[PDB]
């Protein structure tokens, strides 16, 4: 019983969502295609790109070496086998080269063993060194040229972007006050007529033939001295490039910055010609400037823009087009692209090495595999993958999360001029980009805009670049839009009339303005490409997950959009009552759950593996059980069906960590009743009814991991033993079998999680001791009890252990580090006082109290409510639709129904009312069933609600109930007082998820414990644990106050002042006396720290000449 609400849906959200990646790497890692086809980008590009290593003297003798195929292949171990042994799931990539000569010879070392390449799991990410990571896609200005208004003072400039940050120079031509036209390639500033001269243009042939309608020229001529002779020119320019190299005429170097598609080419033809040609005059060719034609250089783009500049400086073509942020200039470097360039980088070093060898060595002693030293593609490539800031940890608290992590567009990346946390033009940028093909309400905090998500239906098709959404054009198809799409306007979804949508007023979007209704009403070829396949496309994948966004105010809606992520799989996930269609997917493209293959059948046996789907061959399916999450969430997989076929409205076949059977179920939906509660729901705190716990509802499991490394220090090998000195207490083997704790070994804080022994020789015991030792058989010792022990964290049953030691296979371990024990501990975490409950509409609040079913608002029939979500502020303050759900709540409680009310499409107040008309003729239908009806209380109420003009007076009591039910909710007693709550109190089944916080993890408490021997303030220890911070703000607080003593205490008797400190842990342990300081441990060390620099800090008393007696001990 699932009631849908809606309209149209011409296509699909576009699988697999994890397509930004996945289908990205592959098309970059072309590999999987017979070495005959596939031509550019990534893998091969970088290959072909990296020009065949030339050598000494431009083709004078032997040694050329060209590249042929590439071979990814025979992978090392195996996923899981990696994460286990900390192996970076890679694969051998060798490449077939063949150096040429000039004395007969064409050697070809097959394969030529080479660097390793990390593969992308089916999931769409990589395992690096054991842990899971995802390559977040950044955005920069799409290669080209756009000019832009000179920020200084009115007077535009010219910027010339390059293919990708790490490739080609980012030039800028600026018309200035003092100087006139500066060409600033990389780090330089040289007159612009200078390069022009070389290129050819110059006095008269240049100006008075280029620049006329807008002077600005007398200055472009001042150094005509430069514009008097090319060649000598390159040299003056060359001589303008540090350091003092040979002014000798070269052409080389400038054999780049234009010449050879080697360090300056947006190749193919796309993204560069199209740009300028449709910005500048028109016409061009692959790369700026063109040399090696025959001596001189035939430039393409340089003066025409200088031209198009002045035209923008008093002319008409104007267009101050800047980093216009128009996603017609916002490139999106997919992983493969990011991973590509890094592969480019590697070769930008492989070669250096080869060129180096080509020389030294002898022509015949030289052959591939020898000039090649497969070290650069490693490092330069492994360094990127797991050492970038764009190569993050896997967010995996709830299945949606990790999914979302790929659908993410980053911007705080490494790219060139890539807005740093506060890069030049932070704010302003953030702003919603009218180009709505990227989430409109996803950002977080203090990091606004920069980190956006991605439109659901966004991007797909021959991808040169930028997101492009979907748009109808009269049933046709969808024509993958194009950010700089003008297609005579688009008409916002709705007005549907089967196929002709008779409107008269088509609410449509054209360019920017929400222009009324162009009304092209062309029916066929829909007003250009008007219409939008569903509204979802104006939104991000996890926002969609809001059954009533339409009402939810954008802003607050983001506190749900985001927050939702911070979920955390529970034991009884349950999809959400009201829910928007998408859920049937987000947890299926997440590959978090198991998907049957061809047809049906089964066999199984049940448990730790759905045993095959008996159609054709056979494949027992292992079910990732009580694993472990990056966030320590603990995602697992439940199964389904004994003997069946392929599907039933879903070929699920075993759930996952949050699917209510293929239905993303982040949290559990329960019954709430709005209304303050004697103060337990203040500000935003929620009130739980113990019941929840009793029925193990919001309970969540978490399995932590611990780690002790057995070093080797020059005092005696650090070893994991069960014979820990004097620890003898029946603890060791009371658990810890043969060294490490056992499984199921329930653990408390303090136990010997894992124990090992160091040698550390602090002192040599003189006799007397060895004597007593000998005498009182005090067998000497050479070992410390350095164990592992479970920290202040309550501990919990020991879910599993793992052991890794060198000598073992793949295992690569920190020099010296011999063996590295690992132990996972589980923790069923029910629900406590603290924790954020936060739902979908962003009603994030922390739990305050959990009342006994005793108290708590009694519904009439006696059922208790579940959560007492406060109204105050909350909705009014935040204005949202967390209500339309609570209303369609009971109207889905008694009617036993789940509901599909998608974003901006259906589930209308009146329909809900109908759905509320029903459920009553039963909810109340029961009273006149069990044999009851309206009691002296509901009489009191109604006769007060109607007074509050809430109910239609004149109707009967009973009639007033249905009235007061298709909105609020029946009287609603108070099991605590026995009486009622004058004035109805709306009730319903919201749906509150439970975020990753849950108190426990927060809250420590120090009194003394561990003192640090490096700094000297409270912290780092082993026994108990604590430490707290006193960041200046609190200092002012005290200053502003007057707790001088209370202050000097937090910089003395409580941290560094060893004397005073002790005076504290003693003056108390003693009794009737409190901490008596005097000389501050700090003042005493300021003088004897300045004296080191040979400064006398004579301390003087009142009379100036009573000269202190400090440190006089």
């Amino acid at each position: 019983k699932i009631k849908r609400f809606g309209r149209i849906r011409e296509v699909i959200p576009l699988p697999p969502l994890t397509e930004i990646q996945v289908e990205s790497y592959k098309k970059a890692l072309q590999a999987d295609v017979p070495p005959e086809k596939r031509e550019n980008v990534g893998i091969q590009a970088a290959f072909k790109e990296t020009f065949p290593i030339e050598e000494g003297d431009k083709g004078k003798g032997g040694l050329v070496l060209d590249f042929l195929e590439y071979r990814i292949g025979d992978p090392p171990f195996s996923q899981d086998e990696c994460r286990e042994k900390d192996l970076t799931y890679q694969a051998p990539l060798y490449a077939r080269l063949q150096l040429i000569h000039k004395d007969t010879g064409l050697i070809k070392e097959d394969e030529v063993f080479l660097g390793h390449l990390p593969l992308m799991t089916e999931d769409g990410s990589f395992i690096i060194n054991g842990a899971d990571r995802v390559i977040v896609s950044q955005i920069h200005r799409s290669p080209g040229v756009y000019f832009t208004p000179d920020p200084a003072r009115p007077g535009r400039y010219i910027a010339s972007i390059i293919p990708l940050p790490k490739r080609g120079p980012w030039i800028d031509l600026e018309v200035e006050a003092s100087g006139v036209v500066t060409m600033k390639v990389n780090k330089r500033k040289f007159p612009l007529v200078l390069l022009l001269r070389v290129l050819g243009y110059d006095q008269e042939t240049l100006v008075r033939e280029l620049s006329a309608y807008g002077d600005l020229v007398q200055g472009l001529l001042d150094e005509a001295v430069l514009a008097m002779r090319p060649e000598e020119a390159m040299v003056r320019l060359f001589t303008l490039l540090r350091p003092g190299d040979p002014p000798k005429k070269d052409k080389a170097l400038a054999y780049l910055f234009g010449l050879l598609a080697d360090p300056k080419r947006y190749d193919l033809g796309e993204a560069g010609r199209y740009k300028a040609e449709e910005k500048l005059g028109v016409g061009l060719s692959g790369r700026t400037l063109v040399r090696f034609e025959d001596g001189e250089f035939k430039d393409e783009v340089f003066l025409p823009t200088l031209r198009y500049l002045f035209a923008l400086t008093a002319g008409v073509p104007g267009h101050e087009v800047d980093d216009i942020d128009h996603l017609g200039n916002r490139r999106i470097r997919t992983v493969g692209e990011l991973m590509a360039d890094q592969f480019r980088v590697g070769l930008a070093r492989l070669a250096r090495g080869v060129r180096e060898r080509m020389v030294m060595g002898s022509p015949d002693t030289l052959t591939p595999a020898k000039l090649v030293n497969s070290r650069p593609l490693e490092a330069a490539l492994r360094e990127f993958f797991s050492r970038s800031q764009l190569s993050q940890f896997k967010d995996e608290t709830n299945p949606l999360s990790s999914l979302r992590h790929k659908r993410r567009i980053s911007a705080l990346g490494p790219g060139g001029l890539t807005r740093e946390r506060a890069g030049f033009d932070v704010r302003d940028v953030h702003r919603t980009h009218y180009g709505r093909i990227c989430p409109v309400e996803t950002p977080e905090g203090a990091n606004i805009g920069l980190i956006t998500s991605l439109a659901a239906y966004a991007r797909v098709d021959a991808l040169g670049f930028i997101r492009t959404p979907y748009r109808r054009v009269k049933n046709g198809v969808v024509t993958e839009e194009v950010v700089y799409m003008t297609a005579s306007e688009e008409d916002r979804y709705t007005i549907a009339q089967a196929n002709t949508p008779l409107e008269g007023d088509r609410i449509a979007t054209d360019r920017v303005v929400a222009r009324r209704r162009g009304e092209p009403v062309i029916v066929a070829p829909e007003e250009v490409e008007f219409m939008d396949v569903s509204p979802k496309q104006v939104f991000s994948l996890n926002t969609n997950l809001i059954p009533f966004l339409e009402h939810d105010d954008a802003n607050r809606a983001l506190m749900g959009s985001n927050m939702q992520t911070q979920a955390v799989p529970l034991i009884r996930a349950q999809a959400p009552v009201v829910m928007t269609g998408l859920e049937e997917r987000v947890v299926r493209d997440s590959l978090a759950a198991l998907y049957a293959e061809e047809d049906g059948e089964v066999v199984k046996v049940d448990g730790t593996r759905i045993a095959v789907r008996y159609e054709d061959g056979r494949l027992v399916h292992p079910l990732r059980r009580y694993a472990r999450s990056n966030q320590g969430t603990a995602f697992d997989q439940r199964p389904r069906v004994r003997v069946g076929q392929r599907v039933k409205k879903g070929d699920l076949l075993a759930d996952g960590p949050a699917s209510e059977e293929g239905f993303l179920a982040l949290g559990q939906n329960v019954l709430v009743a709005i209304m303050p509660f004697d103060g337990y729901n203040f500000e935003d705190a929620i009130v739980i009814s113990e019941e929840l716990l009793k029925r193990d509802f919001y309970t969540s499991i978490h399995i932590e991991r611990y780690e002790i490394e057995a070093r080797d220090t020059k005092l005696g090998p650090e070893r994991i033993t069960r014979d820990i000195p004097h620890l003898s207490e029946a603890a060791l083997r009371d658990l810890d079998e043969e060294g490490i704790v056992r499984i199921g070994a329930e653990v408390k804080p303090g136990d010997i999680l894992v124990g090992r022994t160091s040698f550390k020789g602090e002192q040599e015991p003189s006799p007397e001791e060895r004597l007593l030792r000998s005498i009182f058989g005090e067998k000497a010792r050479d070992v410390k009890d350095t164990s592992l022990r479970v920290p202040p964290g309550e501990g919990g049953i020991v879910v599993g252990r793992l052991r890794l030691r060198r000598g073992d296979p793949g295992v690569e371990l920190k020099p010296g580090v011999r063996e590295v024990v690992r132990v996972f501990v589980a923790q069923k975490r029910k629900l406590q006082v603290g924790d954020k409950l936060a739902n979908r509409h962003g009603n994030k609040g922390v739990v305050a109290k959990i009342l006994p079913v005793e108290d708590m608002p009694h519904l009439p029939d006696g059922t208790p409510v579940d959560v007492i979500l406060n109204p105050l502020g909350v909705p009014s303050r935040m204005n949202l639709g967390q209500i339309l759900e609570t209303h369609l709540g009971l109207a889905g409680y008694f009617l036993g129904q789940r509901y599909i009310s998608p974003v901006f499409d259906g589930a209308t107040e009146p329909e809900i009312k109908e759905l509320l008309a029903e459920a009553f003729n039963l909810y109340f239908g029961k009273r006149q069933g069990e044999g009851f009806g309206v009691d002296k209380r509901e009489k009191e109420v109604l006769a007060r609600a109607e007074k509050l003009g809430l109910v239609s007076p004149g109707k009967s009591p009973e009639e007033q109930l249905k009235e007061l039910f298709d909105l609020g909710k029946v009287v609603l007693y108070d099991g605590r007082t026995g009486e009622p709550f004058e004035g109805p109190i709306v009730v319903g089944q919201m749906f509150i998820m439970k975020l990753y916080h849950m108190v426990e993890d927060k809250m420590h408490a120090r009194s003394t414990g561990p003192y640090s021997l490096i700094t000297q303030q409270p912290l780092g220890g082993k026994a108990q644990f604590g430490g707290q911070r006193f960041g200046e703000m609190e200092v002012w607080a005290l200053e502003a106050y007057g707790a001088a003593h209370t202050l000097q205490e937090m910089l003395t008797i409580k941290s560094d002042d060893i004397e005073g400190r002790n005076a504290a842990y003693q003056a108390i342990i003693k009794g009737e006396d409190v901490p008596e300081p005097s000389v501050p441990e700090s003042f005493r060390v300021l003088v004897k720290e300045l004296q080191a620099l040979a400064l006398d800090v004579q301390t003087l008393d009142e009379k100036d000449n009573p000269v202190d007696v400090f440190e006089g001990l």
């Binding site: 007057g1042 003593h1045 003693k1070 009794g1071 009737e1072 006396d1073 409190v1074």
Partner: protein, 98 residues
């Protein structure tokens, strides 16, 4: 509401920090060493409440604020010798335990 009549104390002293200071040293010489410097022992002594009944509270400042709202005590440049200010404490059994 607050303490044993703060407003009352803030009246006596002039500089709000005075009272703070006097009440401080006070308790810090009261049950800080001795215990027999009370002025509330006639029948107006601070007592608590737990399982077996009352029991004056170890909180020294407590008495002070109450022993100060009383009548005894003084403060200024009086008693001069801080030395003989505690030396006289010898004339009447002090010391603690270790």
């Amino acid at each position: 509401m607050a303490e044993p009549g703060i407003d009352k104390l803030f009246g006596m002293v002039d500089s709000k920090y005075r009272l703070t200071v006097v009440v401080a040293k006070r308790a810090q010489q009261l049950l800080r060493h001795r215990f027999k410097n009370t002025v509330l022992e006639p029948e107006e002594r601070p007592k608590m409440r737990t399982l077996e009944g009352l029991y004056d509270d170890p909180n020294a400042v407590t008495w002070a604020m109450k022993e100060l709202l009383t009548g005894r005590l003084f403060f200024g440049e009086n008693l001069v010798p801080e030395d003989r200010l505690q030396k006289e404490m010898e004339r009447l059994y002090p010391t603690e335990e270790e």
